[PDB]
């Protein structure tokens, strides 16, 4: 029915191999794995206990150190699940535990098994109206075409993404017809490419920190517009921009330890709307 409706959330536990062996763009501090596990169980508890989603929590795999970032292996729109082929070849066995979880929930399963196609679902921004697929180092044109043949009801457009990023490294849906966007020059150029290719005017929400533009919008029954954004302790200037949304229910979620391995808020869940 409404945009942002979900009943189910597919998540995955963190391996202890994440702190040394999961992929990171930038060079920085060592990853506290136990602090990354406590921040991820607060996130699952927002979706499961505080919002009432039905949580499938997949077990961790120590040979897959990026198995927590489950948005990259599955794109779900309505009841059709596109099982993606990820751009990193070491992450391609994370589609095995996802495919069992989404056919236990009885969705329609389309597998991206073409050997020339890559797509990360963190390059996929679903606006409710249409799809924007970021062309990056993890997602080619052939993976964007397989996403277009899977979802034939929706317009699929391509945007170039600057290097080492996903498309949702600087943007997400913060509500119906509302795109949160970072204020860097790679983020602002990509929003201008996305606004000229669409039929619709989207309302725009500029936050100063680019990683803080990744937020989770949810339409939850008997609670309304729900926005999961980053904390004021992490990013103070971008959380006061989120506090101007007085119709939204704002939940601050800390994700400070998974940000060292470029993992953001949308990357750790696949949100499913299952109907009757």
């Amino acid at each position: 029915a409404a945009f942002g409706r979900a009943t189910h959330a597919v998540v995955r536990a963190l391996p202890e191999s994440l702190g040394q062996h999961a992929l990171r763009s930038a060079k920085g501090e060592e990853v506290d794995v136990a602090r990354a596990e406590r921040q991820h169980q607060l996130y699952v508890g927002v979706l499961g206990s505080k919002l009432g989603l039905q949580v499938v929590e997949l077990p961790a795999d120590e040979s897959l150190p990026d198995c927590v970032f489950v948005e990259d292996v599955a794109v779900v729109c309505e009841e059709t699940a596109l099982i993606t082929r990820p751009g990193a070849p070491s992450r391609r066995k994370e589609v095995d535990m996802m495919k069992e979880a989404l056919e236990k929930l009885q969705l329609n399963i389309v597998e991206m098994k073409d050997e020339n196609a890559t797509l990360d679902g963190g390059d996929v921004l679903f606006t409710g109206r249409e799809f924007f697929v970021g062309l990056s180092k993890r997602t080619n044109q052939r993976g964007a075409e397989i996403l277009a043949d899977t979802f034939k009801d929706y317009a699929v457009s391509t945007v170039p993404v600057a290097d080492g990023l996903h498309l949702k490294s600087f943007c997400s849906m913060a509500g119906p017809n509302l795109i949160a966007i970072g204020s860097s020059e790679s983020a602002q150029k990509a929003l201008k490419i996305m606004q000229q290719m669409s039929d619709h005017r989207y309302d725009k929400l500029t936050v100063p920190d680019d990683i803080a533009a990744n937020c989770i919008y949810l339409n939850i029954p008997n609670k309304g517009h729900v926005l999961l954004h980053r904390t004021p302790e992490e990013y103070p200037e971008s959380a006061k921009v989120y506090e101007k949304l007085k119709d939204h229910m704002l939940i601050p979620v800390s994700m400070s330890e998974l940000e060292k391995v470029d993992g953001l808020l949308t990357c750790c869940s696949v949100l499913i709307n299952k109907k009757v």
Side-chain angles (χ1 to χ4, degrees):
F3 168 66
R5 256 294 172 120
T7 54
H8 292 65
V10 191
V11 300
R12 195 146 188 188
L14 283 73
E16 318 287 296
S17 60
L18 174 130
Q20 297 299 104
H21 300 105
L23 313 173
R24 44 212 91 181
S25 36
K27 303 207 130 98
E29 278 251 34
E30 284 311 306
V31 171
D32 200 321
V33 190
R35 199 179 139 92
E37 190 60 81
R38 215 264 169 291
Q39 278 171 344
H40 184 262
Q41 310 137 348
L42 284 168
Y43 172 94
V44 167
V46 165
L47 299 170
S49 98
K50 201 189 178 300
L51 295 176
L53 308 170
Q54 291 299 155
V55 182
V56 199
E57 178 137 22
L58 293 179
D61 199 302
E62 285 278 325
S63 73
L64 300 163
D66 287 282
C67 67
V68 57
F69 308 123
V70 281
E71 142 165 283
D72 290 319
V73 298
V75 176
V76 171
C77 167
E78 303 216 328
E79 41 271 17
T80 302
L82 179 64
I83 300 288
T84 85
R85 184 164 179 267
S90 52
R91 299 196 52 181
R92 292 202 182 121
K93 225 206 195 292
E94 310 175 19
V95 312
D96 282 6
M97 195 78 63
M98 185 51 65
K99 202 206 61 178
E100 277 159 82
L102 302 181
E103 78 204 349
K104 267 186 215 281
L105 298 170
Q106 289 136 107
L107 306 156
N108 185 237
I109 303 299
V110 180
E111 307 170 76
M112 187 180 306
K113 43 218 168 319
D114 184 23
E115 301 120 291
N116 313 322
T118 63
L119 188 122
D120 269 20
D123 282 306
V124 179
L125 172 69
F126 179 52
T127 80
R129 301 293 297 164
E130 73 195 288
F131 285 102
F132 294 109
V133 178
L135 286 192
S136 78
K137 283 191 303 184
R138 314 274 209 215
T139 296
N140 54 16
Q141 163 89 356
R142 189 50 207 159
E145 287 171 28
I146 287 177
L147 193 129
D149 306 331
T150 311
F151 313 120
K152 308 208 99 70
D153 289 36
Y154 298 91
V156 180
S157 298
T158 56
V159 47
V161 179
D163 46 82
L165 301 168
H166 282 95
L167 170 67
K168 293 210 288 217
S169 285
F170 43 80
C171 66
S172 38
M173 302 310 294
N177 215 48
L178 167 74
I179 307 197
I181 188 74
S183 70
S184 86
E185 215 65 44
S186 306
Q188 289 276 112
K189 187 50 74 59
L191 197 279
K192 287 183 295 189
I193 296 157
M194 279 189 277
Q195 275 269 65
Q196 323 156 16
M197 232 169 317
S198 46
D199 295 336
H200 210 194
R201 224 151 101 181
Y202 290 96
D203 301 293
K204 166 182 129 95
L205 184 48
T206 308
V207 305
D209 311 271
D210 277 51
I211 275 163
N214 189 264
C215 65
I216 292 161
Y217 172 66
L218 277 168
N219 192 290
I220 302 302
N222 213 63
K223 307 169 184 107
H225 288 1
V226 174
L227 201 52
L228 269 66
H229 64 91
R230 300 290 295 269
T231 68
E233 288 309 323
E234 280 161 326
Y235 295 115
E237 311 299 298
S238 315
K240 48 191 63 182
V241 168
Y242 278 116
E243 282 145 29
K244 301 162 186 163
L245 287 322
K246 294 164 39 194
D247 81 318
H248 281 75
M249 175 162 99
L250 302 192
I251 294 128
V253 177
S254 159
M255 273 266 134
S256 94
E257 279 279 345
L258 287 177
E259 141 191 307
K260 295 150 144 256
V261 292
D262 324 303
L264 304 187
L265 272 172
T266 63
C267 299
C268 307
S269 57
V270 181
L271 307 163
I272 325 284
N273 192 19
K274 272 253 290 221
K275 310 167 62 86
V276 308

